[PDB]
Amino acid sequence: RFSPYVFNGGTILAIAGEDFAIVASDTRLSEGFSIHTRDSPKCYKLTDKTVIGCSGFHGDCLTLTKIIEARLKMYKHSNNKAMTTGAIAAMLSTILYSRRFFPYYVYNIIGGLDEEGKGAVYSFDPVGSYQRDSFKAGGSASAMLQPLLDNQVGFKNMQNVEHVPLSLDRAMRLVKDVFISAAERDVYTGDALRICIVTKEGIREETVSLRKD
Amino acid sequence: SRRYDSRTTIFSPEGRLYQVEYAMEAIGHAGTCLGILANDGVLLAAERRNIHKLLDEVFFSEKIYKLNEDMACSVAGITSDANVLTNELRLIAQRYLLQYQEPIPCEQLVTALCDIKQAYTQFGGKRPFGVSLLYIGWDKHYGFQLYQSDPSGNYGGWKATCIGNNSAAAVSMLKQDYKEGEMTLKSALALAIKVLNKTMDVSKLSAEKVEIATLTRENGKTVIRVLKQKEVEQLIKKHEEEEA
Amino acid sequence: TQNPMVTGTSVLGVKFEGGVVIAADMLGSYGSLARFRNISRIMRVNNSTMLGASGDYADFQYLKQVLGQMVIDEELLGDGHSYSPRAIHSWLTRAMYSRRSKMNPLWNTMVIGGYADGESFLGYVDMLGVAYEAPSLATGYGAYLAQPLLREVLEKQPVLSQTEARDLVERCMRVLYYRDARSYNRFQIATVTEKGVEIEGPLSTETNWDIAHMIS
Amino acid sequence: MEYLIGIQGPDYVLVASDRVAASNIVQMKDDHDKMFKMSEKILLLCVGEAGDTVQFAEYIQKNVQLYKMRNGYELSPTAAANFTRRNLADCLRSRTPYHVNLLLAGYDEHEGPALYYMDYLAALAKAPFAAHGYGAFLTLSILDRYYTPTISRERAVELLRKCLEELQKRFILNLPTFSVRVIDKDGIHNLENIAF
Amino acid sequence: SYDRAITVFSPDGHLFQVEYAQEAVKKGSTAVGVRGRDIVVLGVEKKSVAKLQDERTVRKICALDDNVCMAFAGLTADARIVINRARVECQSHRLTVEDPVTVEYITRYIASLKQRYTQSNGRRPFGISALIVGFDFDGTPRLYQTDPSGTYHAWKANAIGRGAKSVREFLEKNYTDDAIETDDLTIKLVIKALLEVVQSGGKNIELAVMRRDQSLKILNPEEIEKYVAEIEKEK
Amino acid sequence: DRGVNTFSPEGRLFQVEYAIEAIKLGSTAIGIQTSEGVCLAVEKRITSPLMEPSSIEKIVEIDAHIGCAMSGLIADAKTLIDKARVETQNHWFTYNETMTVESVTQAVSNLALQFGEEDADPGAMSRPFGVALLFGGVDEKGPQLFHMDPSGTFVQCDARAIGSASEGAQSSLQEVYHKSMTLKEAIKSSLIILKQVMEEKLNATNIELATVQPGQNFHMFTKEELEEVIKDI
Amino acid sequence: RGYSFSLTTFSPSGKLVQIEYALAAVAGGAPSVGIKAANGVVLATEKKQKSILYDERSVHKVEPITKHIGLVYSGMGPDYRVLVHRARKLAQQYYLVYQEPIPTAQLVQRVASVMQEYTQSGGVRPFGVSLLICGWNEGRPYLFQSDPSGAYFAWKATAMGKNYVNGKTFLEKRYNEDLELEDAIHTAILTLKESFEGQMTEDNIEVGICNEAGFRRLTPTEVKDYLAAI
């Protein structure tokens, strides 16, 4: 009688290198057949070393970022210590599970880097099941970006290319081409991806446009 | 306020309970109604309030209360409280039936009432139930049996114990006279009117100023008789001659 | 859902160098029946923030008494500290998401706007809780019809004077008079600037029915 | 879709379950024994929903076991049967219907052996022989044809083997082994399992 | 709904309600137990003196389920609640882990319960003290003695009744290794220990034994009589 | 009398400054934080010799890497030791990591000064918890021990004495500890128990000692390890 | 809010201190007689106000419990009115579940049950009204009296209030087991006439009978009628 979910779309990607985590994004939130806006970020800077991506129903994505933001602050001066990344993944797993029976319809990806410095990326279903990876985009073009960086990052089904570790130049050029490809091929494109990228010295945020249609 | 509370649920420095042994002295002011069991059934033997004409008819008395087909209870001490609790325990009896389709073997009932009466002396800050009531009953498990309880909470199988005043007229003399093996309930009536014949100010011990009631049976179902009038005028002339 | 609720159709707005202007028609359409004509759907709140409503109007009267009571209540603490249109947007967002979270949802779909200390603001709050910010907004079928004229001019120049924005939303409101079925002629246009919130009561649309006599 | 059977003798009552723990398409470990040990002389059986058998009847085992090891003597099987009929009957309509149907073999000392029966609606009735499941529909006439009201023990066991070999022959489910327990005036015994 | 804080700290750290419960267990029967290395054994003060008792319902010896059993000492009606809740949660611990429930766990439940009545709002912490005996999955005939302050100790005699400071110093004197046999020297030590206090077992003492997770057997006048006789013969 | 939530003409609460007493009553425990561990010990004061001494639990492990050492009114701590371990596995459950010692000590000390007569439902507390304890634990910051009070006041500690020997043993411990473990803080702490001696020359029946070292998780010492240490003194 | 501790408690003698004070407050109350008669009862009472100033048709002391059961008091004023409120409510619970007018004995069971917990249960003092009951209930009339303890007894005649020893002795003298209709009213009038503090005014007494057709108050033209027939 009411249908309390819509699918506002959006595809967000994060890659874990060896001292970084490229948390990509898109911009266009849209349901039905009309777009709403082209400004909206989907990577949120949680701590200096943790960036979430958050796609799906946009209002529940928004409230979920309010909850995990406010409870990160509720942690931080209850123990006088900032969050790690895996602990963010754990408490977001129990926030997503804690409301199971009317679930958070949201596909969110937590990038960032570990305690020792190596980057990690945690993936989630909308009810909460975290695995650390080095890839796995999620949310609208989930089944489109995944086989490319199954190949150009994981090197699966691929013989002796003498595969090198990734860096902030090869993986930097590996995020823009997959989002112009999904800009061609998905409907929920995005017009300007805002790659919240994380590093050891801090955080910067590159932006570059896409196929605007 | 904490200035106002009587503080009933406090141990004494001697370790005892002040509001509980004040109920034990409430029994000695008003209380009679011994009970004798036999190989046959069990009887209460009771006293009414006074000689005061002005009393038309009691269906059952203010002393002997019916609880099931096979149980009854008698009451000492404060009569206002126990009425409440006996209706309370009557509820317990019937709901055991509702839970089990059994006629509630009486030790279950005495255990339940003693648990709730212990709960009133345990907490809640209220006064304890000032009545050392006792019970007669039968089950298919055990024989004819009577139990006896007090406002403290403990109870027991108390084969010939009386309650109230004169513990010696009623009851130390009984623990020199009761034959534990066989008793032959007519002679239990005779011993009951012996003890009540010693524990009274008057020799007019007819059913104006006595209330004796027996529990017997025929062919399996129990019969609770309240021993109507002329039977008391039979037993009161059973001395004819001496008793002690 | 259960009854023919009394609705509006559209509160379309655009921000400009200066402030932000939002516009809506006064209509109380009872399911293809213009039952209520003179009915204001533009709430004034504290002097730097505005508020519209597109869906159910009864829920908008509920929101005008809770927004009104909240803003006068925190208005009379003295110590400055009025609500920036951050907080009306965020509170209205959490009110509606916490309202559909119990499946007893508010059905109206508004846009709140206002000129803060530095710059203007124009935020959308949906029936479901889908809340965002945009340079130009429209609600209901205006989001299909007024929205192309708004995100055409603002893709060319993202800078508007007050007369260009006011003419722009007057022209878009004329388009919704032409195409939207649940739309009425007169409309309130309403602008918040550096000097505050002000509401121009009932305007009109100069209709152009000159293409009608070429039909055979 | 399991199978419970019982026969009341003159001084005993014997029950037998099917020794198959099923699943969607396959069967799990056979044993899983359905007959739940009550105090000393009562013995109830439970089939029905997979998840209320191990839950409800074990809770009844808790309360009756508490009654025996709280007040000395044990329950007669009449009071245990009306007890679990009360508990299922008032856990029926409220919030979670326990969809189990029970047999309750038992005997008191100073009365006869009793085999109580109830559906999933907790309507209780005595029976000289009762059955359960879909296998009840074909095997119950063999306990109609041959059951005298007075029957010896080994005749009842070989009668029970007639019932299980018919249940082996016509009934479409693979029920190869059956757990048999005779209870009588020396306590719960256990007969050798009948296999094929 | 009565909410007055009864069990409160007085000065010099003295929690007077609990020590008043310590006299309340000092003014009871005289319970005693011996951990006899394959058997355990109890004994308390017979009754008084039955005369007109029923011996079936004068039981200071209580059974929890099958192996653990306890002898309370003090107020004899607040104890039965702790008996009932011990039996209830003991059946719940048969529900979860399904063991012959260990004696350590149930005596931690009793001590935790009485400590929870030294904390709540206005409910007079109990005047009982237990002898939780029993066994476990592998023999180990462990005895435990609780306290109205909720402190349980795993000791081996713990005569904690009314005239039992003499019994526990006697049992300090006369329990080293002579009672490691099956039952006779242990039960002789118990009936000697209570015949220190009162008088013959034909009217006074009653006992209970427990052997290797079976047969919680009480001793009818016969047992007590025999014990007394043996003790007299030895002394 | 007066109630529990009243302030005293000295300046403090009644029940709190009365809860500082009944810590002088009870056994004595000591703990030393070192640079490579933290050692705890307690002379658990066996009454009779007719008995079994290895079930007087005064060294209780909250988690694998937090061990507490209570004294005073014994067995009043079991509710807040229960809250300590339930809060510990709640932290590991919801956050998938270890803890600090100030988070368990933060969580327990909130329950200390949380009582009252007329309040919410009667599952609340009437008297304050008259048990002083200290959580010896190892963290990713460092090994450390947090001395609690019954007042809810908890402090960082590296050498703290509780119980009846809270003055003489604390003043002796004030002058004998500066450097590090190197295996001899546990032998220069039972030496303080050796000066404390009430009934018996501190054999491996009346003292319980346990260390928490960063390599292992904890080590509740058994008998032959203890009397291996006692032989060296 | 509330106390949840009983203020009625046991003396060191072993008796209830508040209940004997309640019987003192009853014994300092207005005198009231009640006479069980062979077909029907009469429950007379004495309404002496301060002055000749009040409405004697305003407040009642004879007042029924909904079918055929009136009840008259002696002692505290408004605690009686609470017991009438509770008694009417209990009689209507019984009437809506069992579809007959309540037997008098059961109404005295439940009124004595509600007066008991005010000897317990949280700061409340006991009522201090020993009201007495009437009722026709099938075949033979009943009469009772619920003391502020909670006890109750049935008889043939009683008095209460001031100098009730003279009422009990005087009714013990003049009572017959067949003494049935208006002769009971006669001796009730000359039991209140015994003291009355003077002149026996019909506006200062009211009676109520249970003459096999429901309890009914007597109109003030009927009491003065028999006050003319003294």
Add this chain to the structure above:
Amino acid sequence: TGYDLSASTFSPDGRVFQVEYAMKAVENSSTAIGIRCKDGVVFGVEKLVLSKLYEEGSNKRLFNVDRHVGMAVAGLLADARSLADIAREEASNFRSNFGYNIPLKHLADRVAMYVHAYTLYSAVRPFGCSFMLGSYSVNDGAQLYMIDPSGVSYGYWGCAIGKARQAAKTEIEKLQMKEMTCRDIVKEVAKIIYIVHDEVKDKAFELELSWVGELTNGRHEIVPKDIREEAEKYAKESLK
């Protein structure tokens, strides 16, 4: 013996001592006068500034409630601030509930029976704060009321609560009450405050005024701020 210390216990002559002990508990606190005239009600509160450390308006004692009624308070500022904010919630429930803006008589009767019904129990103490209200609607008249810790609420013209109300009631009585147009009486309020302040010792009389009037149209303002340098020029009428 000891008929004190509980509000549920009378005196033997009918005088609940926990109320009159709360009444002297506002008599040991500074004054706050309120003067009615035909265009509205003017408040003025004495301040007893302890140290230099407190800044201007360290403790507000002229609260407002419903965008038109005011809160010149006297006693304990915790209790007065508590009933101030629940008066805010009370006019909130009236405006939300009945739509119409709250008439002041109903608010004074409501807060009055709130603080009265709060003096019937031993489980609470009475409030320790006298306070007064005041506003006018376009057809109300300049209504003001004053409420004691007993809970009684009276309509006044020139009521004055505090320590020096024994002095303060005399000048308000000799001031011409009915027909002047509130601006002068804002000025004249300082004459009352400077007369009743009879110290120089570390209290500094750093007063504070607020009103409702035709210059306000049913509102509240700290003065605006100019009469603070105009009614300050009524010094030497207390120094001569």
Add this chain to the structure above:
Amino acid sequence: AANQYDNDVTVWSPQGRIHQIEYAMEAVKQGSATVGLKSKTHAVLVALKRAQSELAAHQKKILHVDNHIGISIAGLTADARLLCNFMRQECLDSRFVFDRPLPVSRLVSLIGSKTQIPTQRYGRRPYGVGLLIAGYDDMGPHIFQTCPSANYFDCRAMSIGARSQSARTYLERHMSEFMECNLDELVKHGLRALRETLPAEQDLTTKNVSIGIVGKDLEFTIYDDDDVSPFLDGLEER
């Protein structure tokens, strides 16, 4: 008999006195000394930490509540931690709902209505802790003493704790060089205000002095044992 005003947050002394929630003000006079103050730009907090033990973190006083609204407790510590879990939790609730910084005045006013309830009702002690909260909202960086009598003060440059009156009377006669006097010379001016509550013999050591800074373009920042060492100057010999 002696003092019938001992069953006593319901009662009134016959003059005006409520007789124990001013005695809770005594119970924060007994607590350790501290001092906060404000500039025209950023407000600071300074606390000395008592070491009643072997050695410790000396029962760390100033607390992080917030996202720039920091506090400084004095008095009881468990009750202080309860009150800052309240203040902390609803400050984060105002981060959640309104998505703005919660202003400092409404913060201190509603805790001034939260600690006011047990002063009102029966058998419940007041929150015996004197907060010295300080934060930077939209206008200048406020600083509020509040009290167990639930009566906060919009003050500047307040000192509360043991013999803190001497720190006030230093700090009262040095208000003229406030509304200027940047961070490097401001916190020196607060430490030489704190260095009078000490018993006339003692350095402001790096161990016992923990301070906090809050204001324009900086988070409420705690300076512990190490970071207080760049603040060094004075003699006062005091």
